[PDB]
Design a binder for this molecule. Structure first.
Ligand SMILES: CC(=O)N[C@H]1[C@H]([C@H](O)[C@H](O)CO)O[C@@](O)(C(=O)O)C[C@@H]1O
Ligand SMILES: *[C@@H]1O[C@H](CO)[C@@H](O)[C@H](O)[C@H]1NC(C)=O
Ligand SMILES: *[C@@H]1O[C@H](CO)[C@@H](O)[C@H](O)[C@H]1NC(C)=O
Ligand SMILES: *[C@@H]1O[C@H](CO)[C@@H](O)[C@H](O)[C@H]1NC(C)=O
Ligand SMILES: *[C@@H]1O[C@H](CO)[C@@H](O)[C@H](O)[C@H]1NC(C)=O
Ligand SMILES: *[C@@H]1O[C@H](CO)[C@@H](O)[C@H](O)[C@H]1NC(C)=O
Ligand SMILES: *[C@@H]1O[C@H](CO)[C@@H](O)[C@H](O)[C@H]1NC(C)=O
Lengths: 486, 486, 486
């Protein structure tokens, strides 16, 4: 009725606060941050193929503006478009600009195929001061500016190209909009001009609009660009009585389009990463990030929270006595253990089986806590220079809805896991204490502070027998029962 | 101190592995699959109304192309459009094609109301070799091809139809695009022609485009189709100086539009089902499915996982001893039970109160696991032949976002339920053991292995006295304090 | 071997049913409703700025139609548009109506800046009988109707306005569509007319349409309105040879656009609230609502459920005996407590340490049950008069997808919280019982029904010593052991 064995668990000076279903803050021994808030100051060029547009945005790249030669034959997973790209050529607009941009970026390559168009008596290769290469008048190198012959003739053009190949073709073509009627007749003789571009299933007809626009690089006239896709087995007809800016061929479309585009000033560095934000690449294993909604590749999911702490250890209770409202700051060899006092003194030893059992249930979630890929490439635009209305509203609302739902999932998840982690480790403590209860049987009594008063001689070999589960209660039974009741 | 009663739980040779919050794989006695991965090889024509377009797609159905007569008067919950549908009439296009198709699908019936239009001196009922019925030249039978009179007169047309009814009217009309100026004056005399269709609050004006288009079904010309919706108390005015393909009346719109369209080659069978995918119908009560994101009717929610197993039973521990690290493979008429050893031998018997308490907290959830009927009809397109740009990007991003969110929910729901199922069944085991302990009081001792050593002779009906809660402890108390402490 | 002490928990006659992971229904003691199903019959004018359009919708207010002068200089968080607003001016359409409305509403103010446009020889300030202001022919007061000079001339107009300020400018302009070729020449001399409006990088060109339309306020002619945004550093050019409806200046755009529009007939009141639906404002602290998906401000999230009850107390079991299947209706000053019966009589007293622990895990959850701000202003349209097709489908699908994910989150959250609530309160009951067991040690025995039979003389200060944990087991042990075993 003198030796005492105690059951306890580790503790630390002070640990980390986390969130559960119940409490707002519960202190625990160890915790891990789940939200990435650090980004590299650069974009990583591997394992994804990044292509830098430099002074050239993707549209001018497709058109073949001065400055964009370095993009011929390029292939990308991610086109890096620079916010300070500048127009260097003839002033132009693109009805449905964003859509052409999406198609080009998504396709993932600038593989251009020349074709000779046997245009009639019209002069070809028109050039301009608004589009100089060095100081020489030039034009978009994928386009061919047709004007009237020296004989003041511009006859009806009528050319056909059949796609009997195994890939869809992208034709880019334009319509010139002169500033005055004299300009119209000087260039194209006919007034009005006109363009019809047709496949078997679709047709685009364009009437030039004559009139003065603001001066840009010396020009008040404009080109509007359009595009036509021609599937294998389809064909394209170009029809014009003037103002056509002819294609010089076509781009090849990949059957499967898996590329995308990222607009950022962030430089391309030397690192390795599969995750790219417009702030730079991510290098992390965390399941969430608060850096940018604009994330391309294999990325953590974007959430609003700055921090989410996942408990990786038990509740931390600080400060001859086992668990009850006590933790052993001395126990540094395990999560649970034994603390005794017999004739030969005291001693603190860790319990392995219960420590391991706790660990495999808390770091059982290890593995499942970033399960899933989230490998996304082409997505949608998520920032805008100016309001445009209905379509943009919808894009903003979609992304906002997404972020709120994932932010919520992240909040609930951590709370649920922490609740479970707390419950598992409290349960493993009780299980240990109960296991000991069942070995001692009637040779001991529950002190009430996580300790057993052992009612018999128990030397260190006997103490050990308890810890490694070999203690036979019958050996000490009648010795013990006597000390208990008489 | 010789008779023993044991508390335990059933087990089987091999159980099913399932996920929890902790362990990635826990073996339970029984489990149920929640992801449907099987489909029927056909579409089921009840209880929903399916209409098979056969060689006719819904747009051609609406126009009244040859081969679409079977659609006249049709009504559907789901219109089945075939990938092998073909054009059988004059080559045409439809600006905002997708939208007219959507409206027609959603509306859910082809109920056409003929109207007499008193067109002027112009000739009516133009026909074409490109649109034969039984080797006789013809045209769309909802449309009326107006050409100039025999006296070379196409007078300005100006007719009005007033909606005095109680439903909105859908008018479909077109503009013809000739291939040459000669053609434009051969049919309509005037050049240019022109069409205006207007209501009180809207207008549409179309200028014909002239130009060569690829020969299709003998024609380089085209019709462009448009539509006008006329609400009750509004009216429609048709104005033309040429090239008008006139309506012969109007389609009736339902006020409430609840139908949709499904594009698939899958045959329509004889089976019964309320869930239709483009792979075929589903016949299932499972809450999720991995067959197709394209799913119409009363459907499981589409998820990315191939399998999610819901525990419908306790932990399965295989292999004179009760529960502690043992399950009884021989207990096959209950979940929890008694096993005993006494003077007359041994026996195993089931306990039903504990079994039923466990079943009620577990099957009580597979009923709340089959609840949200999610009945969705008209949704959005989810696969595409070719990229289009901004709008198609948004649609795909929306569907992809939805799918990832529901896949996460599915993964979490099953881990949470499984964790709860295990906790409940482990708990009912302990509650049974504690129920017996309280019955015995000081007449028995905990042997450590989920067994009580009864320190008095307890015969086979003393055993059943324990199993039924009648065991009076003071009937053996003196005969039990005895061999325990003397 | 005579006095008894019991441990128990409160109850009420009538409790409320809640949902958990297991049970369809669990009766608990107290429960809180989480879904707000009540709205005020009015819109609260504080703390957000509401501007009432009254007879004027936002488009007419921007144009300056008769009756909209109250909206001059208006600024709003939410513009209240009335479904019975009437047109009071020249019949018009807006090709991209919803986008212009969205931009206007989102911007949040009507700040007009007049400018002097020195139009050439054309006459200005055209007015109309279809647009009377105070019984005199007038026009949109933000617009300038140009017509030909008395010299029967309409020369090419070519004006330029430079944006050299620090804000983006919104110009609204229109194009007039005559009914006859005679009207065209009477007003504008030239036939056809024509308008081009352009900046450095964009352009809009319109060809007027001529033709008969239904009479609306005495006119078969129409105006179509367009708009042009001009960034700081950019400029705008108006080119026209007729039919231009010119601006009298521009609206100022905010850099940060944070406002929205709400279309409803509900009156503006004098209550306070930051949540506005189209059925009226909400005054609530509940996290969900089932009133309307259309909701602006700081609102509960919209869900499909009519009710979600969150348990705020333990299980409810109604009706000498302690907890095992019995709650105490008499215990009304605490959640848990003691019930004894010694020599001097009987008695009830609530235990506070256990009541406080439970409460600190249950109310510990219900104020980051709503932690969520959900501050949402400009969103998307969510109801429509008529089907339009693709974009509308996408809008409806997005909102339906959102509502289903939030309805699921609400359902699951309440079930998880309730299960945790039940488990906490069961857990604390047991921890109470165990604590007292730890105190008694070998001086008492578990009666089997929540009660401890004390085997020694115990008066009412001996009882209180148990209930404030001062009780010493050794004092009474020899007395107690003797009665137990002899
Ligand atoms: C004739 C032609 O195709 N290119 C010529 C253009 C076009 O006449 C204008 O751009 C018409 O818009 O005018 C230039 O002064 C120029 O832009 O440098 C010279 C150039 O050779
Ligand atoms: C030119 O147009 C005619 C139709 O008038 C067509 O038959 C022919 O194929 C066209 N030629 C080319 C080269 O496309
Ligand atoms: C991301 O979180 C950190 C703190 O974890 C915070 O300092 C930073 O501002 C956050 N990023 C934001 C709010 O954009
Ligand atoms: C014909 O046009 C006149 C005015 O040009 C109009 O008053 C009349 O209603 C039109 N007729 C029909 C049948 O629409
Ligand atoms: C659906 O799941 C099954 C496994 O249950 C798998 O074999 C099948 O390939 C899956 N279908 C997919 C991934 O399309
Ligand atoms: C008018 O047009 C001329 C060219 O025709 C152009 O140089 C000038 O800048 C324009 N002026 C204004 C005020 O728009
Ligand atoms: C909202 O819930 C209330 C009661 O919870 C119900 O009566 C009402 O019909 C619901 N509102 C709906 C379904 O719009």
């Amino acid at each position: 009725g003198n030796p005492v064995i105690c059951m306890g668990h580790h503790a630390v000076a002070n640990g980390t606060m986390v969130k559960t279903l119940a409490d707002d803050q519960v202190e625990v021994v160890t915790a891990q941050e789940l939200v990435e808030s650090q980004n590299l100051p650069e974009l990583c060029p591997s394992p994804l193929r990044l292509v830098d547009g430099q002074t050239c945005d993707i549209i001018n790249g497709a058109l073949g503006s001065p400055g964009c030669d370095h993009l011929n034959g390029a292939e990308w997973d991610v086109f890096i478009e620079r916010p300070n790209a500048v127009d260097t050529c003839y002033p132009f607009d693109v009805p449905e600009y964003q859509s052409l941009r999406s198609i080009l970026a998504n396709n993932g390559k600038f593989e251009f195929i020349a074709e000779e168009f046997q245009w009639n008596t019209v002069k070809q290769n028109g050039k301009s001061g608004a589009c100089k290469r060095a100081n020489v008048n030039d034009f978009f190198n994928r386009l061919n500016w047709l004007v009237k012959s020296d004989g003041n003739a511009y006859p009806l053009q009528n050319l056909t190209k059949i796609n009997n190949g195994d890939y869809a073709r992208l034709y880019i073509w334009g319509v010139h909009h002169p500033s005055t009627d004299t300009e119209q007749t000087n260039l194209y003789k006919n007034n009005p001009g006109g363009v019809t571009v047709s496949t078997k299933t679709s047709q685009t007809s364009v009437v030039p609009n004559i009139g003065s626009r603001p001066l840009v690089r010396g020009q008040s006239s404009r080109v509007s660009f359009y595009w036509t896709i021609v599937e294998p087995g389809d064909l394209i007809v170009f029809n014009t009585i003037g103002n056509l800016i002819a294609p010089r061929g076509h781009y090849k479309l990949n059957n499967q389009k898996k590329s995308t585009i990222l607009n950022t000033a962030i430089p391309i560095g030397s690192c390795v990463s599969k995750c790219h934000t417009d702030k730079g690449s991510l290098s992390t294993t965390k399941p969430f990030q608060n850096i940018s909604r604009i994330a391309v590749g294999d990325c953590p999911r974007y959430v609003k929270q700055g921090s989410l702490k996942l408990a990786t250890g038990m509740r931390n209770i600080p400060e001859i006595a086992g668990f009850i409202e006590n933790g052993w700051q001395g126990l540094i060899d395990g999560w649970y253990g034994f603390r005794h006092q017999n004739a030969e003194g005291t001693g603190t030893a860790a319990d392995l089986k219960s420590t391991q059992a706790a660990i495999d249930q808390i770091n059982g979630k290890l593995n499942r806590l970033i399960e899933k890929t989230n490998d996304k490439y082409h997505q949608i635009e998520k920032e805008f220079e100016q309001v445009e209305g209905r379509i943009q509203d919808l894009e903003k609302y979609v992304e906002d809805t997404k972020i709120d739902l994932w932010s919520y999932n992240a909040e609930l998840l951590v709370a649920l896991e922490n609740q479970h982690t707390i419950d598992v480790t409290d349960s493993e403590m009780n299980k240990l204490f109960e296991r000991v209860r069942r070995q001692l049987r009637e040779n001991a009594e529950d002190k009430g502070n996580g300790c057993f008063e052992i009612f018999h001689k128990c030397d260190n070999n006997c103490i050990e027998s308890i810890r490694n589960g070999t203690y036979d209660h019958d050996i000490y039974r009648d010795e013990a029962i006597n000390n208990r009741f008489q």
